[PDB]
Amino acid sequence: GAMARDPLPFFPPLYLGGPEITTENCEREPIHIPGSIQPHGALLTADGHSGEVLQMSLNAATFLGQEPTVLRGQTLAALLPEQWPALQAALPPGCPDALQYRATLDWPAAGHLSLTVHRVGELLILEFEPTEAWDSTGPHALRNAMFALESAPNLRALAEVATQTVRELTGFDRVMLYKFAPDATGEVIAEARREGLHAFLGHRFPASDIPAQARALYTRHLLRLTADTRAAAVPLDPVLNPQTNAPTPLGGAVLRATSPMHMQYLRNMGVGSSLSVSVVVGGQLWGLIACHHQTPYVLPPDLRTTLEYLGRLLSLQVQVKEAADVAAFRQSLREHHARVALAAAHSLSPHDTLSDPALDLLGLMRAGGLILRFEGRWQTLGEVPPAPAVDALLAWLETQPGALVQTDALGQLWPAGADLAPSAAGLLAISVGEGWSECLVWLRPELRLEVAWGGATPDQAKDDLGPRHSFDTYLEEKRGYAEPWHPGEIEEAQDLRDTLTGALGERLSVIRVRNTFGRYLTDQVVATLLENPEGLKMGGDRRPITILTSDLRGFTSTSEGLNPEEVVKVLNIYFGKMADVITHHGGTIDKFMGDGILVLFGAPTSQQDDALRAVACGVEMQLALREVNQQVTGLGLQPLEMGIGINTGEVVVGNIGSEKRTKYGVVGAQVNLTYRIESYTTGGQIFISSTTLEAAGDRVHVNGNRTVQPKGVKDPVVIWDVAGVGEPYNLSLAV
Amino acid sequence: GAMARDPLPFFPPLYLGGPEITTENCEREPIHIPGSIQPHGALLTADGHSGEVLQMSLNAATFLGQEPTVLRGQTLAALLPEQWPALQAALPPGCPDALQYRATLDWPAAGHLSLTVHRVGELLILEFEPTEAWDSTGPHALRNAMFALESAPNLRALAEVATQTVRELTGFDRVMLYKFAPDATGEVIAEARREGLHAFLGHRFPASDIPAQARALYTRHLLRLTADTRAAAVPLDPVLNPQTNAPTPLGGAVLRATSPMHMQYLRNMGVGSSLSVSVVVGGQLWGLIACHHQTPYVLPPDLRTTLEYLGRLLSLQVQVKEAADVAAFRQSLREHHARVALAAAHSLSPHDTLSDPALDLLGLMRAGGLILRFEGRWQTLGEVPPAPAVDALLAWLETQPGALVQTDALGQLWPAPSAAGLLAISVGEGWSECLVWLRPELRLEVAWGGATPDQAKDDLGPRHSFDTYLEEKRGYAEPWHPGEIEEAQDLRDTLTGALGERLSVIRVRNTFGRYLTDQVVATLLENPEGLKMGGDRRPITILTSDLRGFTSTSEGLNPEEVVKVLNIYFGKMADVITHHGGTIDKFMGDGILVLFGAPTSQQDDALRAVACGVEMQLALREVNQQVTGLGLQPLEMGIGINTGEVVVGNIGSEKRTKYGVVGAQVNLTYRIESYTTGGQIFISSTTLEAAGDRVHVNGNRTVQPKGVKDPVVIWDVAGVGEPYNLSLAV
Ligand SMILES: *C/C=C1/C(=C/c2[nH]c(/C=C3[NH+]=C(/C=C4\NC(=O)C(C=C)=C4C)C(C)=C\3CCC(=O)O)c(CCC(=O)O)c2C)NC(=O)[C@H]1C
């Protein structure tokens, strides 16, 4: 950004053999050390401790009415017997160079003088200038303006009051408020002017009309002027400070000679006199009050002080009015902003929430297209570039520093993307966390706009070796720019980025609970578990739980002759319906081992009807397979068949994983027994153990039984064939 | 926070039957509508459209030089023939009541008068004051003050210039800068005064000395004065505005009579004249330039305007100076800040990064104790109260709103000793992950100007004593520096911004393998494509293990022995499997399933799987030392490995995916393991072929497990050669 770019190193001044200044090298003119002054005042420099005079402007003798011999090598003690002790008191040695001291002198000849002093290291710089010794303006003009500035209701009105007041105070033929853009171009956003004068209002001027080292200088010394655009500069004698054998810094002297480049610009523009006051906001040059007179004009010093004070006042009020205008913009989005904040705040699946048309993330930013990248997938709303180009933008976005990126001409910030101006000329992108792995990208189409320039566009700065001669309206078509993002839209995006980034709190814990307690647990069960962290006895515990295992009989063998995509599709269908059923019965899915399911009832938390719910779950799982086999045989494949075993008993519960990556699981002979029980089933059948049937109760309807001695058990056991469950399930296997 | 709390509703004023004002209700005094003015000026009110004069102060004739009947019911057009068109243009209908217009008048029997006008609703309010023949040589004192304030190096120095300059401009016997705290107590942070006056510098004063409705009014109308603290008010006549039959709002008139309660305070303090100017920063009352004279003093209006100018400049520079003071505090901490900023940004296990003493989160904030809650658990550095108080503090911090909680007296915020000061930041929203800085008690003595806030309602009028009253505060820590608040917010921003990076790795590990290395997770994220979630048939090598008979022996162990043994076993097996790039797929009871080929495949999948199996068997030697140390029997382990085409893809539901494998070659692996005995590794012929000549074998078996159409040869593995050089001990 040209405004946030320090000036180039300056070249040596002319009187040290520096180069001549043209529009090629003019950002390097050392305008702060011209070694000369404007002829309407006089300048002395003096040693800061002794007060010996070291330099005089060539006109100081004639100005201060003393022969040049006495003056040179006189002391300020003798030249200013009253003001010498005072400026020492006000400008103590070692004080900042910015500090200035002002006084009136009753001088022997031609009237009173205005004295302005400042210190630069070991050197005192004294400016002398005619004054009335009588404030022409009176007390009320400034006080009235200050209150009127503060009561202006918005930025535009504040600009009107500023230029209208300054022109009333000074009599200038033209007073402009000139506002710098981030690329250091500027625009006349208010103008008060004498009748019959050409209007510059609404015109943009190239950044080169005020070069970077002038803008830097104007950030530190807030007023400067050219009283007479025809007047020759007056040299300092000697031109170098003899304390240093180096140029005398003159940036803080209002009598500093103006650059010949700018002198010529003002003549071309028809200007006899010029003055500007910096508006500085947050340490940055926000703009200028820029004044012109058609004929030479020396603004009296007291009028200048009024201006300098208005400068300070305007610097604060520009900030106040800009914040109020932004807040008013956001005030009209309040209803919509709250609604978007509430949804984003607690949402655990951002993709389904932020793409809802009822949320209208597109309208919230007046965007033409929105990209949402969350988890691993990105979807879009509205007008976006073809899918190949969206992936190229997200790839370049990942390289951008920060968590917010904003531009109204994406083609310039990212060259390869200049082709995407029909839908992505402007872009506002925010990163949920750092790295752009999750982000939102509002896009805006190219908006062709005409720009009124003051005589020339920025690329015509070097057509001549000097300033241009025309400042009349020059229209240029703007290419590749979108409508700019309002500062309130920038803020809205910052608010929403913060909300989603905060929401990563839950999105990390619930995925961490599922890793420990159940990969397929419901968002309610996880919520239930987060509230009650204790009671779970991670270090180990033995207690009763019911275990259910199922397998698809021979599906692993029939899957060696299907498409790999058919297998995955069939397993996805099956597990989907199975998981819905098991969830409905409060079971914890513990493993999806191939085509087999293990379900726990009682871990992570138990209830008195664990066994009954497991049996009912088993029945409905079998019934659910009939719905599943419609799609499978719909796809052209053979029906699936399923056997289920259920056991109930004491198992060891706890962190059965490792220490660094825990898993709440169960271990013991009663787990293994469930598999042996399931191994006695055929398709459609459910075998349960005697402990399960006993624990489940009289609501379980059995078909018959078998005594079996599975390998792994010392004693024979009776297993029971389930036909159904009664109230309140009323679930029955078909026969 | 009494500063950001609106005033209470005022009570009706006395002349409408309201209650007498005492220290019981003085926050309800309607000080903006006294119906009266101070006697060094005169006041008219007129209709905003016709200019008809509606009220006059009772002294208006003496001031304006015309008896009341010629003034009353006359029109401002006739009375101010030049100023009437001007003040209408400056004060248009609807303008803010803050907006003021001033002019000078020259009248007979009246000298030069200052006329200050402003508009309240449909009413114009005109104030008349003696003023001076204009003779200034220019605003030199202002210009010099302006640059002196701008060059002040810090906030203390800025305050010193302001009071020094105001005293030089005015002659006031005492000039103070009075800075409000968030609780609306105030402190005199700079003072310029007569030598014979008792110093108030450094003293704090109760919030009630400037009540909430004075503070609110002082945020809109930036100057008020009491010219003579013994001068009697002058009634308005009539007292009520006839447009409304309601009181006339005088908040915006400098001549407004001062609250009687405050007049008595000034007298009790020995003050003869008073004036203060608001410092308003970001729309908030930051403080007052507060001035006392021991004798009466009517400041001419032109000199008040210079004070008003300095108030505006000082509102700007207080902002500039406080920021620079904070930036200078943090500049000392820069290298330390960068050091913590780097660590917290890229950490995927913040518990081990932040507890590092070389990171020095305690010293960064100059704290005595630090709590660190991340993921499931919490942990503490330095001096922390016990685990009940930490679990109770962490529970209560979930109560607090926002992401940052800052106090220097935790006993007051939360009733329930190493922690008198607390600074807490929420990583994300809700405090599920947070940092808590704790500071111990710092016995400080507050110097109060006469009395503590407890003694506000001791008598029905103001206090008489304003001498130093030292009060010992208990349960307090050294206050958090504003730079230390900014450092905590920065660190909170960083850790919260690192949640996205922490999120990407747990999402991937949740899909592709729970125990995956933080290194291979980075691999899957820079190359996310080609994984083929829809389905694919690829060769992979599969390794299954079991601890034979441990399921039975565990029925005789205490459950805590069972979990401890499995934790030791799995923890060692995981180390070995990860060293060999295996993907632990399931911890099935005491069994492990490991994939070599998923999610990614190298060309030596089979060899690594065989060598991993050998090392797991060897690693069981170091496990069986800890298991027998605990007094238990030693574990035995059998291993089977198979290599074959399997279906690879999303095997879970569509909603909760899991990258898994399915097929007969997966199931054959468990059958191959079932033939092993303790200490033995059986592998299939396809594994032996893919692994290559570096595998050392003992013998072989032809087996035909059911569910298999054709017999298969399995091979007993003795060890692995270069570069592994592992052999099963024999
Ligand atoms: C290659 C160098 C160039 C150059 C140099 C230059 N310009 C300035 C200072 C100013 N230029 C201003 C420009 C404007 N005045 C207007 O009235 C408008 C629009 C209506 C514009 C854009 C202004 C305002 C200033 C500030 C000075 C002032 O207030 O008069 C300097 C610095 C002068 C100095 O302080 O010594 C220099 C070196 N101007 C170019 O256009 C090219 C040729």
Ligand SMILES: *C/C=C1/C(=C/c2[nH]c(/C=C3[NH+]=C(/C=C4\NC(=O)C(C=C)=C4C)C(C)=C\3CCC(=O)O)c(CCC(=O)O)c2C)NC(=O)[C@H]1C
């Ligand atoms: C129960 C009511 C109380 C009360 C009322 C009250 N106080 C004010 C205004 C001011 N009080 C000030 C206090 C101080 N002056 C000092 O010099 C110091 C410290 C050294 C303090 C704390 C100040 C500065 C003001 C502003 C007025 C001024 O500049 O003199 C009002 C409002 C006055 C008005 O605008 O009419 C009221 C109602 N003060 C209490 O102490 C209790 C009794």
